[PDB]
Each structure stands twice: as structure tokens, then as C-alpha cells.
């Protein structure tokens, strides 16, 4: 077996994680390598954290890793079973990831659903003018949280709400906040299985209810869809994923059942709500917190978009340090840290260690974002590293892996970077900005909170001034 810190007994390494595991797996890989041996619990873990050994788990023996490792909370309203976010490769798996691929996130779907996304980003303009005017700081974790879902909102369902916090809104905000409330913290029926038939922490009912909850919204709009579509039959094609979802199902192409696309829309809009919220709130911070960057930043946007407020998304191609940004705010925070776990699906060997049946592999990247072996100052936020450098996060870079890599990368990624790379533009190019207060200001940056997605434990405050 791979390297790795003594295991005690019952608890293997668990009592050493602390709050910020992806934190203690980066110092202890120092010691251990880049293949490391992590007991939690029952559960066998192998952590990576090199370049090389994430293209040899990921690419190289890329099916033999290929599955996940599942949860007890993913079990509600049989998820695990029905999720292509944690069904193993197979034909159902495919066919989701290809409708994902081809039909959902092509460049005609993200360009078609580009006027629909405009609204809600007008809105969170409004939103922080208003606050301008008063004087008020925003709370940038709020307002992204918001904004992100209205995007998501607007991109999934075609919902045109005219508030920025609309009823349909918060709902959806109080839901997810219940998912990451549960989930974020330790079940210990996924470390000792004789726990598992008793749920003793009721996690698996606790999360029943809020996907319930969750399923029950997206089949209402998907039943209403249904029906505007049958009464209005020379309607004009609405420019969504709920649209793509009723065709799909209408054409009967694809051995897949109604809950399936129910479930994938769950997994689109959760998987798209806490990444972009924490990522869009780091950005902002790092940008306040490196005052140079900021200003080269807005030099880009005053040059490119001049006194248009909104960049049209297809300018993006223009904006090489709005990219650079975001590239290297992904390099420094990727939501995940340890990304999705993924699982061997058989005995392989790989750099001379046994990796056995059903181990959880967790990828660092985290660690690798931050390994001075590989990246140049890597603590220092330096957007300018990626300049004219063909390192990008698609998969291919095994030193930049926000989105992971091999058969089961992140297939929301062209949604991501357009919410990603549109949100941080509307607010550095729209506002001047300025720390609420500056006293605990450089704590205030450093300091993480894990969970769903690891983000500030001090949420950003800042005054937005024309
Ligand atoms: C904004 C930044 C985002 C980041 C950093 C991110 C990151 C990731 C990562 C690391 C994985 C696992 C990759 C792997 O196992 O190799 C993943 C998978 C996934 N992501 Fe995201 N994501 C983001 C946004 C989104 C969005 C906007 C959506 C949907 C609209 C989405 C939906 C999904 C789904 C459904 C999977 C499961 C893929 C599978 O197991 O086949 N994500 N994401
Ligand atoms: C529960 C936990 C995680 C997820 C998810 C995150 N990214 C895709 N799916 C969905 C439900
Ligand atoms: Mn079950």
C-alpha cells in the first residue's frame, strides 16, 4: 500500500484532519509523496497530489478510476442510484454525460441562454447601486449566492423574476443552505459501516427532506412546461435546459426515465450553486486584497466594454486578464479542494503500490494549486502567470485541476466560466471598492471554512463607490 501517517486503531488518521483537511492532506503529502495512504476510519483512502500521479489515476488508468465513492447522504430519494454524478460508467452514465456534452452546454445552447442570463445580471447591478447610493457595504457572499442562482435559475428554467431576491429564489438559497449544512459535516456512517443501517445522526433523513424539496420544484416547473407546451402549441421555443430536458423525453431516444432528467437538473443546479457563490466571492477578495491587479483588471474592461455596464459573453475572447483572473483564482481556491472523490473499480498498481477494489481516491488540488515545485510564489495571487500561457483548466493541465480531469471532468464547466467570468465583471467594472474594515483584513482572507465548498469564514464585506 502507498505511504502514509500511522493509523490508530478504530480511528485510523481521522483525529489529526482538523476544519481544514485539504489543508493537513497538502502538509502531510510533504512528508508521505504524491500516492499516500489515508485511513478514515474503515474507509481506505489514497490521496494524490502531484501532476504526474493525477494524470496516471486520471488518464492513464482513467476507467479503472473512473467510479465514486458515495456517500450516505447522496442515498436520498435513491440519488446514488440515479445520479449521473455517481453512477459508475455504463450506458446510462454516457448517455447523460452526452446529452450534457452535445445538446445542454454546446456553444448554440450557452449562446442561446446568454439574454436570459443579461436580466439577472442587470439585476445584481441594481441591487449594488442601490447600496452605492446609501453607502451600505455589500455582503459579497449574499450577493453572489444570489446571483448565482438567479443565473443557474435563469439558464435551467427560463425564470425572469423581476426582484433580485425573488420568493422562487430564496427558497431554492434556504434549500441549498440546508444540503451544505448536512453534508459539510462529518457522517460517521461513512467511516464505520456497522453505523450505516442506523443512520445515528439522521443525516440521510435530514437530506431526504431538502431533496425532496428540491425534486418537487423541478418536476413542478418541468409538469408546467409540460402542459404550456401542449396548450400553446405555436409558442415560441423558450431558450433552456428545461426546454432541451420535455424534447429529449418527447423523442424517446434515450432508456432513460422521467427521473432521470429530474435528477440531472438537481445535480446541474446544486452542482452550479455553491461553486460559482464561494468562487465569485474569492475573486472578489483577492482582487481588493492585490490593489495592482484590480487596476489592470479594470484598465482591460474601461478599454474593451468602455461605458457598456454588461459584457456581452461572446467578448470574452477579448478579455484575456478577466481569464487570467479567474484561471488563477481557480489556481488558489478551487471549491473543492479534494474535488469529487472517485473509486478503483478493481486492484491496480501504479508507481509500484497496491491501490485495492473500492478505495477512495481523493485528488488534492488543492495542494498541487499551492506546490512551490510547481508553481512560482505560489501564496501570491498573480493573474499575469497565465498570460499567453497555454495552461488552462479544461483537463489537459495536470497542474491546474479545479474541474478535475479523464471520464467524469466537470461537464457544467462552459456554464461555470461564463457565470464565473460575467459576475466578476459586472461588479469590478461597474464600482470602486473598498474593505468595510481593514483591521483584521489580511486574517480575514487567509482564513478557510470547509464544507460542500471551502470558502472565506469571514464573508466579504465591501463598499461599492462610482
Ligand atoms: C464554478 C466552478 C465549478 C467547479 C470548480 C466544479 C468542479 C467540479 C469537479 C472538480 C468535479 C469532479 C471532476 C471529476 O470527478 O473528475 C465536478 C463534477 C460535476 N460538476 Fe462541477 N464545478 C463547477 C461548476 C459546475 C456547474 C455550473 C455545473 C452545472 C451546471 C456543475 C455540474 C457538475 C456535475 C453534474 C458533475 C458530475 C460529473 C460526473 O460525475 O460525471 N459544476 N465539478
Ligand atoms: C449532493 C452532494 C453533491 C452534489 C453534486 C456536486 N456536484 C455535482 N453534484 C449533489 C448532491
Ligand atoms: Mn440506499
Redesign the pocket.
Known sequence: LPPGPFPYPIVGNMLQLGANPHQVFAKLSKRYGPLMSIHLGSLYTVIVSSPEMAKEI?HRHGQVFSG?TIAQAVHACDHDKIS??FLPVASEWRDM?KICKEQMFSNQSMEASQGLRRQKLQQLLDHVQKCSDSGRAVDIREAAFITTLNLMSATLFSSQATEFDSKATMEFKEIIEGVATIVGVPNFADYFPILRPFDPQGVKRRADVFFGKLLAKIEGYLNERLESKRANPNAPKKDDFLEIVVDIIQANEFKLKTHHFTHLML??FV??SD??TT?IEWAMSELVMNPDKMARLKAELKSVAGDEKIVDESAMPKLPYLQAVIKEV?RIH???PL??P?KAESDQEVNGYLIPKGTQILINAYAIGRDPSIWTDPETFDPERFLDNKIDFKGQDYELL?????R?????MP??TR??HMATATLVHNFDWKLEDDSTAAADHAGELFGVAVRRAVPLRIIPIV
Do not use: E
Not at 479545479?402 to 479523464?406: A, I, V
Open positions: 486520471l465514486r449521473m454524478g454525460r445535480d446541474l452542482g452550479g461553486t460559482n468562487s481557480m478551487p471549491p473543492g474535488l469529487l472517485r479545479p474541474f478535475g480531469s479523464g467524469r471532468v466537470c461537464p457544467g456554464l461555470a457565470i464565473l
